[PDB]
Symmetry: C5
């Protein structure tokens, strides 16, 4: 049902924001840690987002592309196969924005004397510094792992089976910083809010200023991550789709 899908898409937006919150939380205070392993533990923590999404059934942009193809044995028609994408997309964003608001209200950016807020500003910052092609390609790369993770999940029967199997694929595109439109729908707007609203005690604790993140604003988010990344994402999904259809009608 259209409205049902919108609400479950809102839910995914929240699920993915929880994923990123856990990741930021885990990687916060790890300047001394080897970059690989800080990012690794962050990715492993990020997978709560997909274990959640799946185990709970929640529509997340393109995530279940291949499940949907397999629930037709690749003999169903396409309008029927990819209708709601835009409604899901919008539901995802709504969910992520809402969660950002809550997260802001919780005053958590000051966790660890601001280091939490800083991990957000640096993460969200880095993400808005992508050349259109690099961002598309990181978007391709990211949704590759997401779709494959979800896909592999379907063979899993127990709770243990579905979770302990997606952890690796999620941790990999995360700990590699591949770009995912929906995760960034929380992360980048979050770097915005914090940059554009953090008190002086923050900036002072963390030693820094909005100057350092002159790039975190809505306009940049949209044109320098969200757009190229989302595309790359549809390419990642449409790709698995493609290989799917040949392996099947062969």
């Amino acid at each position: 049902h259209p409205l049902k899908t919108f609400y479950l898409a809102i839910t995914a937006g929240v699920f993915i924001s929880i994923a990123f919150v856990f990741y930021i939380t885990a990687t916060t205070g790890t300047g001394t840690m080897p970059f690989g392993m800080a990012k690794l533990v962050g990715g492993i923590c990020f997978s709560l987002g997909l274990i959640l999404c799946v185990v709970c059934g929640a529509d997340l942009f393109t995530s279940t592309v291949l499940i949907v193809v397999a629930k037709a044995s690749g003999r169903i028609t396409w309008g029927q196969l990819a209708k709601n994408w835009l409604n899901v997309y919008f539901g995802n964003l709504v969910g992520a924005l809402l969660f950002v608001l809550l997260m802001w209200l919780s005053g958590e950016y000051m966790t660890a004397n601001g280091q939490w807020g800083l991990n957000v500003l640096q993460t969200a910052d880095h993400k808005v510094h992508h050349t259109f092609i690099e961002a598309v390609c990181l978007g391709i790369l990211a949704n590759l792992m997401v779709c494959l993770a979800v896909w592999m999940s379907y063979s899993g029967r127990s709770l243990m089976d579905k979770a302990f199997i997606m952890v690796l694929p999620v941790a990999m595109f995360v700990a590699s910083g591949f770009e995912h439109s929906i995760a960034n729908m929380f992360m980048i707007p979050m770097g915005i809010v914090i940059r554009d609203f953090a008190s002086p005690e923050f900036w002072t604790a963390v030693g820094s200023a909005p100057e350092n993140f002159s790039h975190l604003t809505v306009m940049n988010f949209i044109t320098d991550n969200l757009i190229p990344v989302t595309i790359g994402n549809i390419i990642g999904g449409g790709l698995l789709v493609g290989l799917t259809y040949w392996v099947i009608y062969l």
Copy 2:
């Protein structure tokens, strides 16, 4: 039976205190370690409490809200969902206060040359220094992960699935330090008891003193934490139930 529910509430209060002690113990001496990792491991250890609770049938204030609604097929009025709430709540409390007690008689505060008891004091102090809205939102975010853990658990094959699916949603809320009213029923009174009743050799070890924790009276506990945290908790359950109503409604 009303009184049986009360004993199971008391049991949850106890299981949750077990969880918070394990957490304190994991994180003791982690000023040297990176904030994330220390808190991640803490939260993970803390999940033993929510595992005990579920896999043992203890009643933890509001944890099961989604299940009760699911079973009741969606047809249940709020007064009907809420009758036991106050009974569970207070049974939880007696359980947690009782645990504070045994925990104290065991003389655990001196563990690690005062560093343990000190872990308690710092952890609890930090909680009463919360702005009312921050505390509500932390309470909301706590109960989101709690209900979702219980819910993901509700449909597990193995005992393994039932328990270990919950580990991550728990660890994430405890690593981010969201506020669970009932786990605070142990952490904060445990602090205050140490504050009000610790031996001076203790203060000589930790190099510190009671004035440093002026905000650890019971009144500060209740007004500066327990009240807004319980509120936010309930809101967190209300939002999942409401979400439920959309997808049990459509």
Copy 3:
């Protein structure tokens, strides 16, 4: 029940709990650049191997099963006709821990990691006798709570996976939180004592310490300042769970 069989299952539990503690000492050997909680966690997780040994091989650990033992026969089994057993199992567990002390000594393992291993034993044993009677009982209560809960939660077990990987958290937690368990002690403290009373001069010198740093590691100390109050707290760790269980139950 059957005399010799229960006795050997008991001994075996003593060896299983001793193995638990050894693995703990080994995991937590040399812990400097390491926070207290983290080393104790990793060691305690290492520790649960022992209780997994007991539950999966059916060895008889003093009180570990309390909830099952009363809730099977339905209390349909009388006081003394229930006590004779525990005393037996207990003495068994001890024989086991003790034999394992002998072996772990003959093995010359206290010299492992250049004395550090055996020193780890020394310190870990030193700690356990500096408990006030009350504290030590309360810790006996706390330790057996976790153990019976771990075992208890073990019965819900589906797979081997379920029956084992569930007990790990309640064991690691009781153990890394420093709770007191009488049968584990039956190995740990005597091992501290042999090492402290027999460690070569090369040892004392390599570890950089001395007998007087552990003035308290003596048999009568162990028995009176630990084994008694911890054992008692342990029994209350059982009486507690049984009380709450039977009535939670009888509120039908």
Copy 4:
């Protein structure tokens, strides 16, 4: 169909490239860290590529030797069993090169502040630094572990069983750094792309120069790594056939 199988081999080629990217990411920034621990953890990350392959039904050169023996129940032919190697091998290669391109365009070679690209250079190089004999022996060793890993995997039930039983055997050959021709197909050429097309800003940022990594070329890769490593790989498969053959045979 030769083309469905070529698609599956391409799939394994991509799968194994993803494995190696996860390994580079997991081990980027580890001088403070002990050799064995960082290699072990990169090894563990690596095995995502082989769980992907096996759980998704791809086609990795020789990986399923003992499978196509015992599964055919011994009723299978040498010649009309090994003729496809050529096709699978080429398909693996195209998977490899294609991912090199994607990872190049993604601008990942700069992620982690240049140390991603540096890690690739150091590893990719390292592999062309073996005697013919070292290369072959590392080939037997690598592929011995891969085949045993699948052989154990092809004996499991749940998703867990099928996938986890493979970790130890894979992380093992990867931490020990034994040489698998198919992994080398991504690693070495990706190092070459990075080295040649690597912007001057990159060389400047890491503090190196193409000169540092002279050994990284097509000819050396092919002749001092690829050739001997493939030979040894084949020997490790052959020896597993010989052996497992007599085993499940008598």
Copy 5:
């Protein structure tokens, strides 16, 4: 089938050598790490060998000893039993030796700038330094835990159970430094080969001289370690044999 046994025995030989190699790899350059943490982890790694053995049906000397005793069902008379251990033993051994040669030809003692090969060296040099009493006691402790591991393995439903169960009991016999005759059959000889054939570049890079490892000789491996560890190993097998026997033999 006797020769089949020989092959599964050789295969355990190789299985258990892959065990020790994984171990040397996880533990190279862990000089700075807390002793117990590094060993605990190397021991988590080592269980590859034992899991490989169980899962793939390889026969590791005395490791499945409770089965070689309770299958003939105590009907397992003495001569009737000794007619096999000899075979598995020689098989394990051949397999370990072969893996030694492959590891040497791989050029591997130089990984991490000789630190890996030095790891082998020092671990070799350490096993050869025990009293007879200690070596037997530790051989007892090792095969004891391997038997408990394989034994709890038989109660396992899923593959996941067959393997993850053996992980703690093997990690423990290993992190604790207990002696398993078949695993020493690879490690001490690997140290010897390395010490006897290692390059000038190697000694020079790791900071050392062959002269630091003069205790690593074949005669020493045998009389100082293999004989007593082996005895301990048989006591860790025939011991659970004795015990278990009468346990299920009374009530």
